[PDB]
Amino acid sequence: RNFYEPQIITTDNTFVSGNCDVVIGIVNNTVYDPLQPELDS
Amino acid sequence: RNFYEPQIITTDNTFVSGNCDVVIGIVNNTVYDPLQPELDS
Ligand SMILES: *[C@@H]1O[C@H](CO)[C@@H](O)[C@H](O)[C@H]1NC(C)=O
Ligand SMILES: *[C@@H]1O[C@H](CO)[C@@H](O)[C@H](O)[C@H]1NC(C)=O
Q1: What are phi and psi of B10, to 5 degrees?
Q2: Closest alpha carbon within chain B to A7
Q3: How far apart are CA A7 and CA A35, in angstroms?
Q4: Distance of CA B8 to CAs A2, B11, B16, B33, B40, Å?
Q5: Residues A40, B37: C-beta atoms closer than 8 Å
Q6: Which stretch of DSSP H or E encloses residue B37?
């Protein structure tokens, strides 16, 4: 909040609560998964 | 800070900010890599 330091959205620094219906003003964007699934081939 | 309880350095309990140049007094040590790369068949 108090300093400008942008970061890439990741599934680790954001938690998940419920489905997409109930909230108001929610926007549609993809969320990057952690490095380990990307490392897996 | 308030009690002595040493722990093994791990990539999960430490976050990463930038490269090695800008800080002062930084020392050279190896950080335990996560379990996913270690657990490879
Ligand atoms: C915010 O205000 C604008 C006013 O133009 C409105 O169109 C928009 O629906 C408002 N946002 C939400 C989430 O309702
Ligand atoms: C701490 O002080 C000592 C004094 O001997 C000095 O040599 C050292 O460079 C200082 N630490 C840093 C990070 O500058």
Answers
A1: -140, 155
A2: B17
A3: 15
A4: 32, 10, 17, 11, 22
A5: no
A6: helix B35-38
Given resolution (angstroms): 3.6
Ligand nearest to the CA of A24: 1
Which structure tokens are listed for A41? 């081939």
CB-based contact A39 B34, cutoff 8 Å: no
What residues have CB less than 8 Å from A12, skipping those under 6 apart? A34
Element of type H or E holding A37: helix A35-39
Residue B15 one-letter amino acid = F
Sign (positive or negative) of CA dihedral B25, B29, B34, B40? positive
Secondary structure class of B10 (helix, strand, coil)? strand
